[PDB]
């Protein structure tokens, strides 16, 4: 118990790239396959300084059509102390990668990637709220619930160290 | 009592922005006591740079009392103060965000600049010997900023908060 | 609490485009220091070259070490285990310039610095990929540098001490272009 500080959570900003390093793969992942809808939670971080306060999410094991079979990964917009100046609804383009952690000396990565433009009709991408049917429900996060297969995963260096990487890049346009 | 500091809060890039909330409950202490002046957290202008504090009075400040919104900002000392110029002389420009979406319309914020003045003393290399007047020293800035009134008008107030957005013209990098 | 924490801190020791600047304060008790003791080394913290780059740390002696150890300040830096090092490649590679700041005023005087750069040698242990702990353990991460950066009496000209500090700094070249 210790207040303000943790506003180290203020402080998690991005480049717009955030990289998330899930570590015990092993027993998060059987922890997973025993409860469905086990959630990682990456940290919460800022597309950029005074931006969209985002967070990633998880499911090791998998969620919806992917349960039990594939990675599951969806991004989601939490509320951040200046939404007020951001544009509304979240629109910037989405890249997912799960990394190949490979020597890009010895034999270049072959990353895992998808990439997407939200859609302005997902109530989650228009500002934290508001109430827009809190209880809708379905996942309060956008993305892919067959990201890679449990197969895919052990191929490569994906899982390495009993870790896996998770790149979440939010494309930062300028050009008016 | 280990708060340990941090020291890590640097401007993006040069961009302080300062956000009141609790504003109702902060502006009826105001009135209720002058001078009493809320504080920014300390800033470096940029990584190895120069150490700033804005300040602001909700309040008003001798020309502003009772009126408006005054604010202003000081150097401090900082902890790479000796290999830096002095006097401090990098352009600052306040602004009052206007909180609309600047997406289906542009905002109109409120912005006042300057070139720090030579003379005034806070500007001045600090840890000179000061004692003991000194700590004086001492915030330039506007005590009209924006009144009481023509703030209210648009949204320079929404969610009973304030941004104050205090930009600072950084030194250039030279050559490719 | 402890509650440290103090781990989520040494996270976000980033450089600023490559550079880290290291202040050592009370220059005078460490110097002392260092003479009764010649192998007491000063730490920067722990830094990354960039965001999920690289983590590095700069040491000195400031009565030196080896062929420095009495008569100068001798400057090292090593590579540490990081959190990315999996995604980065191996060895280490990017050249480090090492410079002692001349701490004048740079709108008068255009301060000399003392420097020193290199280019990481491959065939060197040190700037392989680190263990996991362990591979090797020891204190592991010896460094590279220079044992006679700067000599006592130069450290004297100037401003490279004053108000009992000195500023060490360490930028290392990232590849960028891209």
């Known amino acids: 118990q210790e207040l303000r500080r943790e506003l180290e959570e203020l402080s998690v900003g991005s480049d717009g790239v955030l990289i998330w390093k899930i570590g015990s793969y092993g027993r998060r992942l059987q922890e997973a396959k025993a409860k469905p809808?086990?959630?990682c939670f990456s940290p919460a971080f800022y597309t950029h300084k005074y931006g969209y306060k985002l967070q990633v999410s998880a499911?090791?094991?998998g969620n919806g059509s992917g349960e039990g079979t594939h990675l599951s990964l969806y991004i989601?917009?939490?509320p951040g102390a200046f939404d007020n100046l951001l544009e509304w609804p979240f629109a910037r383009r989405v890249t997912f990668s799960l990394l190949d952690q490979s020597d890009p000396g010895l034999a270049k990565p072959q990353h895992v990637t998808?990439?997407?433009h939200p859609d302005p009709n997902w109530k989650n991408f228009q500002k934290?709220?508001?109430?827009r049917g809190s209880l809708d429900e379905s996942?309060?996060?956008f993305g892919y619930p067959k990201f890679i297969s449990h197969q895919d995963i052990r191929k490569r260096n994906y899982v390495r160290?009993?870790?896996?990487?998770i790149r979440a890049a939010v494309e930062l346009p300028r050009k008016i």
């Open 161 to 165: 160290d009993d870790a896996v990487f």
């Open 76 to 78: 989601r917009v939490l």
């Open 114 to 116: 998808e990439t997407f």
């Open 37 to 39: 809808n086990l959630e």
């Open 139 to 141: 996942s309060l996060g």
């Open 128 to 131: 934290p709220g508001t109430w």
């Open 59 to 61: 499911f090791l094991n």
